[PDB]
Amino acid sequence: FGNWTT
Amino acid sequence: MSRKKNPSVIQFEKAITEKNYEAACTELLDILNKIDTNFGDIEGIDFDYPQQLETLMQDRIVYFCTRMSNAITQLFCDPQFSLSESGANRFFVVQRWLNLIFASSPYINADHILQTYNCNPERDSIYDIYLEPNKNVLMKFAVLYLPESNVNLNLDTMWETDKNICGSLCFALQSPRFIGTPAAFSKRSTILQWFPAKLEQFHVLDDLPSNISHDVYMHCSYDTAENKHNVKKALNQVIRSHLLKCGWQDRQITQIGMRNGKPVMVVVLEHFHSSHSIYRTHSTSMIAAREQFYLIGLGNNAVDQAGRDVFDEFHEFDGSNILKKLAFLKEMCEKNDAAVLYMPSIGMDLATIFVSNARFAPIQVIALGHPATTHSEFIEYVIVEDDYVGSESCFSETLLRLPKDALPYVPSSLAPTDVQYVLRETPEVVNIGIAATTMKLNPYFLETLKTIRDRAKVKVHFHFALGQSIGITHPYVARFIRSYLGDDATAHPHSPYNRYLDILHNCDMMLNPFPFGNTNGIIDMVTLGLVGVCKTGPEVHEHIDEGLFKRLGLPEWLIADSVEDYIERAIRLAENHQERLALRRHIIENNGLKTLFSGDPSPMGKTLFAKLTEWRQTN
Ligand SMILES: O=c1ccn([C@@H]2O[C@H](COP(=O)(O)OP(=O)(O)O)[C@@H](O)[C@H]2O)c(=O)[nH]1
């Protein structure tokens, strides 16, 4: 899991 | 046996045959909604297929996209098919997935549908579509005006026809996690210049696709324009307007409560678990903060045990409703009379953007989980390491520049420890790794890799380890890459962490993307003893690369100012086998990974206690 929107 | 009936492509096709348009839209929205929930995976969508595709995933996905594309064509071309405004609002939320049904199919886009809506045989270009004057056709047109559309649209003509359709389509076109192709990236470039002045005119989200608002907010950081974050200011105003209109009152601040010795800092998290980017970067500083402050964590059940454990106490948000979540956060701040509100990430959850547009504590603070300004009145301070900052002018808020070592990083829970370094002495082909999310790919970065391959005196092969390239996203991304680099590149789908390292472990060097660079991606690089080139710029999301390379005793020449500089250095590092091996032996022999995991975590807790004291002086 990295930096992106739900 | 399973929780809930799967969406069926067959159910969808049967509906289109019997001309049951409302069953057909329902089945289609059911299918897109499920894909959206699974970030592009099509597991648990029902469809028959030729047995030759049982064991060939990429070919199964293309079959699915083609069959869906065929069905959507038969439906949206039928002139007897009327689309309600609620139908259109639901489709605008999931246009990103419609885009992929067509873009990952052989058809590329839905322009063949749009051509059926043209009523003017006397038109200058096949790219100009003239619509009958009625709402039905305009919504069918806007829904099927996809990121890869090659059809002309003028936003001024659209704005003057229906503001709500125009606003919705601008939201929908900023919403995809991959907007890297020339057609998509340039639609979005244009939107970011044109739309902020139009979005200010809105008093509510009630008629826009609100559930992709956080996407509009986050995704603008990936354009190249200096003024690219303006849409966030516009959006902050509409969220504020929307919030007040729901009968929201700010907390009237009148008492600083203490629990044990200290004052209370409420922490609101979006993503936080031992293997997530945000815990790796920001957990150490929040642990240490617990010496100055009493720490209340708020989060969803996604946050694991090791994540709950960095707080004195922790509360699950009970559900998805934003008004209830801001009500629960006011109760918490009103009962503990909170002094500080800290969000280490803002922009990945819509709830957290609402929170940054209201008052819960006298000192309200963000870190750079997502490294962009908020353009919010309600945010006083930004936490950031000194060596990560370019211009102070990139940020609407006051910077708290903490010393280089103020946020010691942490390994992922999934990190290996026994890692065999491989330093290929003279490889015939220099394998070049790109550890990037679909968000960070763009025409500028791919022109650049293309030019590097064309000038390099040595054979290069690019290996893209692509976060968020899942299910129906991947064909589209693969062809984007192939269109620049032909057989000299491989597009690896999103993989589990161990597998993602195997892809990079196979490489001789790495290139950091731009304008928006890596962080955790650089920890992944030095975890494997790899070296690579990066670009620097005014934004933090351009400068982190420059910062971390310097924290590793790495040379200035690995850091580029311009694109042309980047190209020379990328070539230099690829051609000079002996030099790159030197740099790799440096990072390995001087335990470079161990230096990123080390430092003084305390400065966040002290600098924020300091600011409360100054504030308390002045009540
Ligand atoms: O195929 C992939 C791609 C990415 N990642 C994870 O995503 C992280 C970083 O993604 P992010 O978007 O946060 O990048 P950053 O800008 O923070 O480097 C990596 O370190 C990996 O843990 C992964 O596990 N598999």
Numbering used by the authors:
A (entry chain C): 1 to 6
B (entry chain A): 1 to 619
What does the literature reporting this entry say, word for word?
Soluble HMW1C-like N-glycosyltransferases (NGTs) catalyze the glycosylation of Asn residues in proteins, a process fundamental for bacterial autoaggregation, adhesion and pathogenicity. In contrast, NGTs are two-domain enzymes that consists of an N-terminal all-α domain (AAD) and a C-terminal catalytic domain that adopts a GT-B fold, as shown for Actinobacillus pleuropneumoniae NGT (ApNGT). We focused on AaNGT, an inverting GT that catalyzes the transfer of Glc from UDP-Glc to Asn residues in the consensus sequence Asn-X-Ser/Thr. The heart-shaped structure of AaNGT, either complexed to UDP-Gal/UDP-2F-Glc or UDP-peptide, shows the N-terminal AAD domain and C-terminal GT-B fold catalytic domain, which is composed of an N- and C-Rossman fold subdomains.
